[PDB]
mmCIF file of N, CA, C and O in Angstrom:
data_model
loop_
_atom_site.group_PDB
_atom_site.id
_atom_site.type_symbol
_atom_site.label_atom_id
_atom_site.label_comp_id
_atom_site.label_asym_id
_atom_site.label_seq_id
_atom_site.Cartn_x
_atom_site.Cartn_y
_atom_site.Cartn_z
ATOM 1 N N UNK A 1 -3.375 6.213 9.183
ATOM 2 C CA UNK A 1 -4.153 5.077 9.711
ATOM 3 C C UNK A 1 -5.647 5.175 9.446
ATOM 4 O O UNK A 1 -6.394 4.450 10.062
ATOM 5 N N UNK A 2 -6.097 6.086 8.569
ATOM 6 C CA UNK A 2 -7.519 6.265 8.332
ATOM 7 C C UNK A 2 -7.805 6.437 6.858
ATOM 8 O O UNK A 2 -6.988 6.953 6.110
ATOM 9 N N UNK A 3 -8.985 5.986 6.446
ATOM 10 C CA UNK A 3 -9.444 6.153 5.084
ATOM 11 C C UNK A 3 -9.736 7.617 4.773
ATOM 12 O O UNK A 3 -10.378 8.332 5.551
ATOM 13 N N UNK A 4 -9.276 8.046 3.613
ATOM 14 C CA UNK A 4 -9.426 9.403 3.144
ATOM 15 C C UNK A 4 -10.541 9.448 2.120
ATOM 16 O O UNK A 4 -10.603 8.599 1.199
ATOM 17 N N UNK A 5 -11.460 10.364 2.341
ATOM 18 C CA UNK A 5 -12.562 10.649 1.431
ATOM 19 C C UNK A 5 -12.139 11.478 0.216
ATOM 20 O O UNK A 5 -12.321 11.053 -0.925
ATOM 21 N N UNK A 6 -11.465 12.606 0.468
ATOM 22 C CA UNK A 6 -11.122 13.556 -0.579
ATOM 23 C C UNK A 6 -10.132 14.583 -0.032
ATOM 24 O O UNK A 6 -10.101 14.892 1.171
ATOM 25 N N UNK A 7 -9.367 15.148 -0.963
ATOM 26 C CA UNK A 7 -8.529 16.315 -0.690
ATOM 27 C C UNK A 7 -9.315 17.555 -0.942
ATOM 28 O O UNK A 7 -9.846 17.773 -2.025
ATOM 29 N N UNK A 8 -9.329 18.431 0.054
ATOM 30 C CA UNK A 8 -10.064 19.681 -0.028
ATOM 31 C C UNK A 8 -9.193 20.844 -0.504
ATOM 32 O O UNK A 8 -9.666 21.743 -1.214
ATOM 33 N N UNK A 9 -7.943 20.879 -0.054
ATOM 34 C CA UNK A 9 -7.055 22.001 -0.342
ATOM 35 C C UNK A 9 -5.605 21.543 -0.122
ATOM 36 O O UNK A 9 -5.363 20.431 0.316
ATOM 37 N N UNK A 10 -4.677 22.408 -0.517
ATOM 38 C CA UNK A 10 -3.274 22.175 -0.494
ATOM 39 C C UNK A 10 -2.583 23.452 -0.112
ATOM 40 O O UNK A 10 -3.059 24.519 -0.435
ATOM 41 N N UNK A 11 -1.464 23.316 0.576
ATOM 42 C CA UNK A 11 -0.640 24.473 0.969
ATOM 43 C C UNK A 11 0.794 24.040 1.153
ATOM 44 O O UNK A 11 1.112 22.849 1.225
ATOM 45 N N UNK A 12 1.687 25.034 1.286
ATOM 46 C CA UNK A 12 3.053 24.741 1.689
ATOM 47 C C UNK A 12 3.252 25.411 3.051
ATOM 48 O O UNK A 12 2.873 26.577 3.247
ATOM 49 N N UNK A 13 3.765 24.635 4.004
ATOM 50 C CA UNK A 13 4.034 25.118 5.383
ATOM 51 C C UNK A 13 5.365 24.581 5.824
ATOM 52 O O UNK A 13 5.605 23.383 5.781
ATOM 53 N N UNK A 14 6.267 25.477 6.235
ATOM 54 C CA UNK A 14 7.573 25.034 6.684
ATOM 55 C C UNK A 14 8.312 24.226 5.578
ATOM 56 O O UNK A 14 9.081 23.304 5.844
ATOM 57 N N UNK A 15 8.059 24.571 4.320
ATOM 58 C CA UNK A 15 8.713 23.929 3.198
ATOM 59 C C UNK A 15 8.175 22.548 2.802
ATOM 60 O O UNK A 15 8.738 21.891 1.914
ATOM 61 N N UNK A 16 7.062 22.163 3.433
ATOM 62 C CA UNK A 16 6.376 20.896 3.204
ATOM 63 C C UNK A 16 5.028 21.147 2.549
ATOM 64 O O UNK A 16 4.286 22.022 2.991
ATOM 65 N N UNK A 17 4.719 20.389 1.497
ATOM 66 C CA UNK A 17 3.374 20.330 0.940
ATOM 67 C C UNK A 17 2.444 19.586 1.916
ATOM 68 O O UNK A 17 2.766 18.512 2.383
ATOM 69 N N UNK A 18 1.330 20.218 2.264
ATOM 70 C CA UNK A 18 0.312 19.662 3.137
ATOM 71 C C UNK A 18 -1.006 19.686 2.392
ATOM 72 O O UNK A 18 -1.317 20.614 1.589
ATOM 73 N N UNK A 19 -1.852 18.677 2.662
ATOM 74 C CA UNK A 19 -3.159 18.570 2.055
ATOM 75 C C UNK A 19 -4.199 18.608 3.175
ATOM 76 O O UNK A 19 -4.017 17.980 4.244
ATOM 77 N N UNK A 20 -5.308 19.294 2.923
ATOM 78 C CA UNK A 20 -6.389 19.371 3.872
ATOM 79 C C UNK A 20 -7.360 18.261 3.510
ATOM 80 O O UNK A 20 -7.899 18.281 2.438
ATOM 81 N N UNK A 21 -7.565 17.336 4.417
ATOM 82 C CA UNK A 21 -8.317 16.077 4.155
ATOM 83 C C UNK A 21 -9.668 16.010 4.833
ATOM 84 O O UNK A 21 -9.792 16.327 6.013
ATOM 85 N N UNK A 22 -10.654 15.506 4.098
ATOM 86 C CA UNK A 22 -11.908 14.997 4.675
ATOM 87 C C UNK A 22 -11.720 13.534 4.883
ATOM 88 O O UNK A 22 -11.370 12.831 3.964
ATOM 89 N N UNK A 23 -11.912 13.069 6.107
ATOM 90 C CA UNK A 23 -11.717 11.696 6.448
ATOM 91 C C UNK A 23 -13.025 10.903 6.259
ATOM 92 O O UNK A 23 -14.086 11.342 6.691
ATOM 93 N N UNK A 24 -12.924 9.720 5.684
ATOM 94 C CA UNK A 24 -14.144 8.937 5.388
ATOM 95 C C UNK A 24 -14.863 8.542 6.677
ATOM 96 O O UNK A 24 -14.246 7.973 7.569
ATOM 97 N N UNK A 25 -16.164 8.842 6.722
ATOM 98 C CA UNK A 25 -16.996 8.491 7.865
ATOM 99 C C UNK A 25 -16.764 9.359 9.088
ATOM 100 O O UNK A 25 -17.299 9.046 10.164
ATOM 101 N N UNK A 26 -16.022 10.465 8.990
ATOM 102 C CA UNK A 26 -15.828 11.419 10.096
ATOM 103 C C UNK A 26 -16.444 12.757 9.712
ATOM 104 O O UNK A 26 -16.469 13.109 8.489
ATOM 105 N N UNK A 27 -16.908 13.555 10.672
ATOM 106 C CA UNK A 27 -17.465 14.870 10.325
ATOM 107 C C UNK A 27 -16.424 15.843 9.742
ATOM 108 O O UNK A 27 -15.202 15.639 9.918
ATOM 109 N N UNK A 28 -16.890 16.878 9.051
ATOM 110 C CA UNK A 28 -16.038 17.954 8.528
ATOM 111 C C UNK A 28 -15.222 18.605 9.641
ATOM 112 O O UNK A 28 -14.107 19.070 9.420
ATOM 113 N N UNK A 29 -15.749 18.636 10.871
ATOM 114 C CA UNK A 29 -14.976 19.194 11.975
ATOM 115 C C UNK A 29 -13.678 18.437 12.245
ATOM 116 O O UNK A 29 -12.814 18.981 12.874
ATOM 117 N N UNK A 30 -13.575 17.193 11.764
ATOM 118 C CA UNK A 30 -12.365 16.395 11.899
ATOM 119 C C UNK A 30 -11.329 16.573 10.770
ATOM 120 O O UNK A 30 -10.275 15.925 10.785
ATOM 121 N N UNK A 31 -11.646 17.432 9.807
ATOM 122 C CA UNK A 31 -10.729 17.699 8.694
ATOM 123 C C UNK A 31 -9.413 18.208 9.238
ATOM 124 O O UNK A 31 -9.393 18.996 10.161
ATOM 125 N N UNK A 32 -8.311 17.739 8.678
ATOM 126 C CA UNK A 32 -6.981 18.131 9.112
ATOM 127 C C UNK A 32 -6.035 18.299 7.941
ATOM 128 O O UNK A 32 -6.181 17.683 6.909
ATOM 129 N N UNK A 33 -5.057 19.163 8.147
ATOM 130 C CA UNK A 33 -3.916 19.299 7.268
ATOM 131 C C UNK A 33 -2.863 18.245 7.621
ATOM 132 O O UNK A 33 -2.388 18.060 8.779
ATOM 133 N N UNK A 34 -2.454 17.509 6.587
ATOM 134 C CA UNK A 34 -1.459 16.479 6.760
ATOM 135 C C UNK A 34 -0.359 16.658 5.754
ATOM 136 O O UNK A 34 -0.596 16.946 4.591
ATOM 137 N N UNK A 35 0.881 16.424 6.172
ATOM 138 C CA UNK A 35 1.977 16.502 5.220
ATOM 139 C C UNK A 35 1.874 15.448 4.127
ATOM 140 O O UNK A 35 1.374 14.365 4.383
ATOM 141 N N UNK A 36 2.306 15.757 2.923
ATOM 142 C CA UNK A 36 2.096 14.837 1.792
ATOM 143 C C UNK A 36 2.630 13.422 2.053
ATOM 144 O O UNK A 36 2.032 12.479 1.575
ATOM 145 N N UNK A 37 3.716 13.297 2.820
ATOM 146 C CA UNK A 37 4.258 11.977 3.091
ATOM 147 C C UNK A 37 3.414 11.089 3.986
ATOM 148 O O UNK A 37 3.682 9.903 4.093
ATOM 149 N N UNK A 38 2.417 11.658 4.641
ATOM 150 C CA UNK A 38 1.458 10.910 5.435
ATOM 151 C C UNK A 38 0.360 10.223 4.577
ATOM 152 O O UNK A 38 -0.283 9.356 5.061
ATOM 153 N N UNK A 39 0.201 10.627 3.326
ATOM 154 C CA UNK A 39 -0.817 10.073 2.447
ATOM 155 C C UNK A 39 -0.343 8.864 1.656
ATOM 156 O O UNK A 39 0.747 8.849 1.103
ATOM 157 N N UNK A 40 -1.251 7.904 1.533
ATOM 158 C CA UNK A 40 -1.154 6.833 0.568
ATOM 159 C C UNK A 40 -2.431 6.952 -0.261
ATOM 160 O O UNK A 40 -3.355 6.129 -0.145
ATOM 161 N N UNK A 41 -2.512 8.034 -1.022
ATOM 162 C CA UNK A 41 -3.652 8.226 -1.946
ATOM 163 C C UNK A 41 -3.170 8.824 -3.231
ATOM 164 O O UNK A 41 -3.472 9.947 -3.596
ATOM 165 N N UNK A 42 -2.417 8.022 -3.949
ATOM 166 C CA UNK A 42 -1.927 8.455 -5.219
ATOM 167 C C UNK A 42 -3.031 8.933 -6.175
ATOM 168 O O UNK A 42 -2.855 9.943 -6.862
ATOM 169 N N UNK A 43 -4.149 8.213 -6.206
ATOM 170 C CA UNK A 43 -5.166 8.524 -7.171
ATOM 171 C C UNK A 43 -5.803 9.860 -6.835
ATOM 172 O O UNK A 43 -6.036 10.674 -7.723
ATOM 173 N N UNK A 44 -6.023 10.109 -5.546
ATOM 174 C CA UNK A 44 -6.610 11.368 -5.152
ATOM 175 C C UNK A 44 -5.655 12.551 -5.374
ATOM 176 O O UNK A 44 -6.109 13.613 -5.778
ATOM 177 N N UNK A 45 -4.366 12.361 -5.038
ATOM 178 C CA UNK A 45 -3.403 13.411 -5.237
ATOM 179 C C UNK A 45 -3.345 13.763 -6.734
ATOM 180 O O UNK A 45 -3.419 14.918 -7.074
ATOM 181 N N UNK A 46 -3.255 12.774 -7.614
ATOM 182 C CA UNK A 46 -3.137 13.060 -9.033
ATOM 183 C C UNK A 46 -4.390 13.704 -9.566
ATOM 184 O O UNK A 46 -4.342 14.591 -10.433
ATOM 185 N N UNK A 47 -5.543 13.287 -9.065
ATOM 186 C CA UNK A 47 -6.788 13.856 -9.494
ATOM 187 C C UNK A 47 -6.928 15.278 -9.003
ATOM 188 O O UNK A 47 -7.541 16.106 -9.690
ATOM 189 N N UNK A 48 -6.368 15.573 -7.827
ATOM 190 C CA UNK A 48 -6.453 16.906 -7.264
ATOM 191 C C UNK A 48 -5.503 17.811 -8.061
ATOM 192 O O UNK A 48 -5.940 18.843 -8.549
ATOM 193 N N UNK A 49 -4.268 17.343 -8.217
ATOM 194 C CA UNK A 49 -3.157 18.101 -8.832
ATOM 195 C C UNK A 49 -3.344 18.340 -10.321
ATOM 196 O O UNK A 49 -2.847 19.344 -10.843
ATOM 197 N N UNK A 50 -4.066 17.441 -10.992
ATOM 198 C CA UNK A 50 -4.438 17.589 -12.397
ATOM 199 C C UNK A 50 -5.585 18.589 -12.593
ATOM 200 O O UNK A 50 -5.533 19.394 -13.532
ATOM 201 N N UNK A 51 -6.576 18.571 -11.696
ATOM 202 C CA UNK A 51 -7.816 19.350 -11.848
ATOM 203 C C UNK A 51 -7.832 20.734 -11.150
ATOM 204 O O UNK A 51 -8.779 21.506 -11.312
ATOM 205 N N UNK A 52 -6.800 21.029 -10.369
ATOM 206 C CA UNK A 52 -6.750 22.263 -9.578
ATOM 207 C C UNK A 52 -6.373 23.435 -10.462
ATOM 208 O O UNK A 52 -6.408 24.585 -10.025
ATOM 209 N N UNK B 1 -6.175 4.070 -0.323
ATOM 210 C CA UNK B 1 -6.672 5.499 -0.168
ATOM 211 C C UNK B 1 -6.766 5.900 1.319
ATOM 212 O O UNK B 1 -7.852 6.132 1.882
ATOM 213 N N UNK B 2 -5.604 5.950 1.964
ATOM 214 C CA UNK B 2 -5.498 6.209 3.376
ATOM 215 C C UNK B 2 -4.445 7.269 3.628
ATOM 216 O O UNK B 2 -3.686 7.656 2.734
ATOM 217 N N UNK B 3 -4.415 7.717 4.872
ATOM 218 C CA UNK B 3 -3.370 8.622 5.362
ATOM 219 C C UNK B 3 -3.172 8.423 6.859
ATOM 220 O O UNK B 3 -4.092 8.059 7.616
ATOM 221 N N UNK B 4 -1.947 8.685 7.299
ATOM 222 C CA UNK B 4 -1.594 8.860 8.685
ATOM 223 C C UNK B 4 -2.044 10.246 9.158
ATOM 224 O O UNK B 4 -1.945 11.225 8.436
ATOM 225 N N UNK B 5 -2.728 10.283 10.286
ATOM 226 C CA UNK B 5 -2.993 11.293 11.190
ATOM 227 C C UNK B 5 -1.999 11.946 12.031
ATOM 228 O O UNK B 5 -1.713 11.250 12.970
ATOM 229 N N UNK B 6 -1.307 13.026 11.648
ATOM 230 C CA UNK B 6 -0.178 13.570 12.454
ATOM 231 C C UNK B 6 -0.609 13.974 13.865
ATOM 232 O O UNK B 6 -1.741 14.394 14.026
#
């Protein structure tokens, strides 16, 4: 339900890919790990996954 | 360019 600024990092937890997100217009203290299925940011995921 | 907040 929130705009995503950028993906900071990626991990696997409990067999799920999770991304650590900076949320647009929120402080870095609000950064959270979210499971990949929670994202609708194809362009960011591909840009992250291509450049990592 | 959005995501759900778990």
